[PDB]
Amino acid sequence: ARKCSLTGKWTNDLGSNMTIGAVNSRGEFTGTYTTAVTATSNEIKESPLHGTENTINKRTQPTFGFTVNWKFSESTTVFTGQCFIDRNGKEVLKTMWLLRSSVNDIGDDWKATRVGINIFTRLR
Amino acid sequence: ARKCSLTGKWTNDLGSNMTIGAVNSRGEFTGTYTTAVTATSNEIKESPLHGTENTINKRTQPTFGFTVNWKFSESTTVFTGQCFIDRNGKEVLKTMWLLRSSVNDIGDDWKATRVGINIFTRLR
Amino acid sequence: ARKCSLTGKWTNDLGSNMTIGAVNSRGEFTGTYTTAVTATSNEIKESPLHGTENTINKRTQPTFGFTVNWKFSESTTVFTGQCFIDRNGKEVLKTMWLLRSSVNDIGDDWKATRVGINIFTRLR
Amino acid sequence: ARKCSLTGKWTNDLGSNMTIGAVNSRGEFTGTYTTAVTATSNEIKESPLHGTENTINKRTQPTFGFTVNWKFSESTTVFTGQCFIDRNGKEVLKTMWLLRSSVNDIGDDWKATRVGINIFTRLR
Ligand SMILES: Nc1nc2c([nH]c(=O)n2[C@H]2C[C@H](O)[C@@H](CO)O2)c(=O)[nH]1
Ligand SMILES: Nc1nc2c([nH]c(=O)n2[C@H]2C[C@H](O)[C@@H](CO)O2)c(=O)[nH]1
Ligand SMILES: *[C@@H]1O[C@H](CO)[C@@H](O)[C@H](O)[C@H]1NC(C)=O
Ligand SMILES: *[C@@H]1O[C@H](CO)[C@@H](O)[C@H](O)[C@H]1NC(C)=O
Ligand SMILES: *[C@@H]1O[C@H](CO)[C@@H](O)[C@H](O)[C@H]1NC(C)=O
Numbered sequence: 001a002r003k004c005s006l007t008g009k010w011t012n013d014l015g016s017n018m019t020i021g022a023v024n025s026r027g028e029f030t031g032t033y034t035t036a037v038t039a040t041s042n043e044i045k046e047s048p049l050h051g052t053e054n055t056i057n058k059r060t061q062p063t064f065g066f067t068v069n070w071k072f073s074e075s076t077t078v079f080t081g082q083c084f085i086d087r088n089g090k091e092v093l094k095t096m097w098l099l100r101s102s103v104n105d106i107g108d109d110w111k112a113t114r115v116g117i118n119i120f121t122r123l124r
Numbered sequence: 125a126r127k128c129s130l131t132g133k134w135t136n137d138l139g140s141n142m143t144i145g146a147v148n149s150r151g152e153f154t155g156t157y158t159t160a161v162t163a164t165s166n167e168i169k170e171s172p173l174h175g176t177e178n179t180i181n182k183r184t185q186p187t188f189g190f191t192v193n194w195k196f197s198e199s200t201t202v203f204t205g206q207c208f209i210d211r212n213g214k215e216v217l218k219t220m221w222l223l224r225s226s227v228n229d230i231g232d233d234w235k236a237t238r239v240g241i242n243i244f245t246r247l248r
Numbered sequence: 249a250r251k252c253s254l255t256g257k258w259t260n261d262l263g264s265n266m267t268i269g270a271v272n273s274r275g276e277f278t279g280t281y282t283t284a285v286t287a288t289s290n291e292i293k294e295s296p297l298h299g300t301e302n303t304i305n306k307r308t309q310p311t312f313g314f315t316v317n318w319k320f321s322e323s324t325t326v327f328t329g330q331c332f333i334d335r336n337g338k339e340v341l342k343t344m345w346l347l348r349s350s351v352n353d354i355g356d357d358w359k360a361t362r363v364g365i366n367i368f369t370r371l372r
Numbered sequence: 373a374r375k376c377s378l379t380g381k382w383t384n385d386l387g388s389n390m391t392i393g394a395v396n397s398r399g400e401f402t403g404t405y406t407t408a409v410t411a412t413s414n415e416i417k418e419s420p421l422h423g424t425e426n427t428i429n430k431r432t433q434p435t436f437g438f439t440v441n442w443k444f445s446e447s448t449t450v451f452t453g454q455c456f457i458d459r460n461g462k463e464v465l466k467t468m469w470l471l472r473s474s475v476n477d478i479g480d481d482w483k484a485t486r487v488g489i490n491i492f493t494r495l496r
């Protein structure tokens with residue numbers, strides 16, 4: 001019965017925050033992503049996110065992915081991971097991400113993608 | 125003058141094909157992703173995708189990200205890359221992807237993520 | 249003044265431990281990587297590693313990469329990261345890794361690579 | 373019998389070249405990596421590489437990994453992949469890589485790792 005659900009307010013290991021609304025019945029959802037550019041406490045930015053969670057076998061702990069469309073740069077980041085209910089134990093989203101920068105020349109493509117992780121917990 | 129445009133029919137280096145529809149003014153779009161099994165010859169699965177293309181500075185070669193919500197498994201894949209005008213004049217999407225599998229215990233999280241690339245060109 | 253030094257005994261966020269020996273003047277080094285199975289409790293496998301640490305500008309927090317040649321499978325893992333002095337003063341290696349599995353046909357290449365992270369701290 | 377062997381001279385999809393010497397009986401090997409920084413035809417640089425190939429079940433087509441210790445930067449890149457003998461069909465190494473940059477502050481770690489691929493063919 002214990003459905004790990006993406007809807008709500010989350011924060012992460014770098015101190016960025018994220019809010020995701022209601023997941024409709026085809027798994028779609030939208031959110032906002034707020035990020036720490038600086039000392040962390042002054043300059044904030046909001047960017048939209050859009051994703052889908054997988055509904056195959058109505059899992060507790062489904063996998064999901066979403067795209068963050070940076071409002072302050074020409075970059076795009078995509079996240080994928082899984083909503084786990086560890087013991088008790090908050091909910092926790094374990095994610096991996098790819099950050100695509102824009103390059104002017106296709107000869108620079110090879111260097112345009114960063115990778116990393118994010119762990120998200122419910123915001124308090 | 126012409127730009128690189130996600131809208132249309134695409135194919136890739138693995139033989140999978142993808143159709144993307146119109147890109148609205150927020151950069152959102154929807155589409156379909158077809159791939160195949162065995163000796164790539166008969167059974168074709170279709171899965172929807174949703175993503176966004178970065179609109180910051182209305183670039184001619186925009187970055188973008190999308191999420192593929194697999195119809196036939198518990199998995200999710202995210203793609204991000206850039207729509208280039210190649211040196212030979214043809215549109216190409218250079219992407220990288222993260223394929224997240226569903227695991228059962230959070231202790232298996234470590235091994236749930238594959239990474240790789242796809243290069244898409246227009247279909248005839 | 250003290251720098252961050254790969255030489256020594258290390259442990260990580262998954263419970264695996266690693267020993268690295270002396271780093272010669274070319275930046276080369278060797279060591280051992282131990283991990284475990286089931287409920288992480290009894291059977292420990294040991295595999296050798298070899299790598300190099302970047303020496304350009306004799307930095308105090310050098311980047312490095314190493315290859316783990318698994319003793320118990322056909323697989324290979326590579327790690328790369330950086331040896332930091334953390335904010336709390338303790339040495340930490342932040343790494344990312346690519347785990348390549350062996351496949352049989354070149355058509356399965358696409359799915360042979362996992363990615364993720366490990367964070368190492370010194371053992372007592 | 374057809375052993376895909378790392379020893380030799382290779383080139384890649386970006387026009388970098390690589391030479392690897394003899395693989396000893398524990399799988400170790402060393403090489404040089406020559407890279408195109410510019411128009412491709414003028415400024416060359418050589419950097420050492422060191423790796424191991426997996427010897428578990430003496431495979432044709434073993435997996436391998438290696439570290440390239442950049443001589444002209446504080447970065448490190450690691451490659452992992454597999455030596456395939458496709459039909460006939462050259463030998464071909466399909467690789468993935470992680471490029472670690474040096475960051476001054478551990479607060480920048482998250483952005484320090486790029487990922488991508490390289491396909492290598494025997495040099496002619
Ligand atoms: N992809 C990604 N981007 C991030 C994270 N945190 C963060 O601040 N960013 C911003 C940094 C960069 O300035 C911007 C696009 O260049 O994305 C983050 O965790 N992931
Ligand atoms: N990791 C990696 N690095 C490369 C490749 N090609 C290339 O020229 N480099 C260089 C570029 C960069 O200037 C240097 C270290 O910063 O590594 C490459 O294919 N992979
Ligand atoms: C996240 O939320 C809290 C306020 O509830 C705050 O510490 C911080 O400003 C937020 N982080 C960002 C990047 O805005
Ligand atoms: C992709 O489309 C082409 C039609 O141009 C078709 O020949 C091919 O089999 C398709 N591949 C898949 C997996 O749908
Ligand atoms: C790592 O080392 C510690 C000793 O400090 C031990 O308790 C632990 O079980 C070891 N883990 C493995 C997998 O070797």
Ligand SMILES: *[C@@H]1O[C@H](CO)[C@@H](O)[C@H](O)[C@H]1NC(C)=O
Binds near residue numbers: 383388389406407416
């Ligand atoms: C690779 O080798 C050939 C010469 O055989 C040449 O085209 C090129 O200069 C080499 N590439 C680099 C980066 O040196």
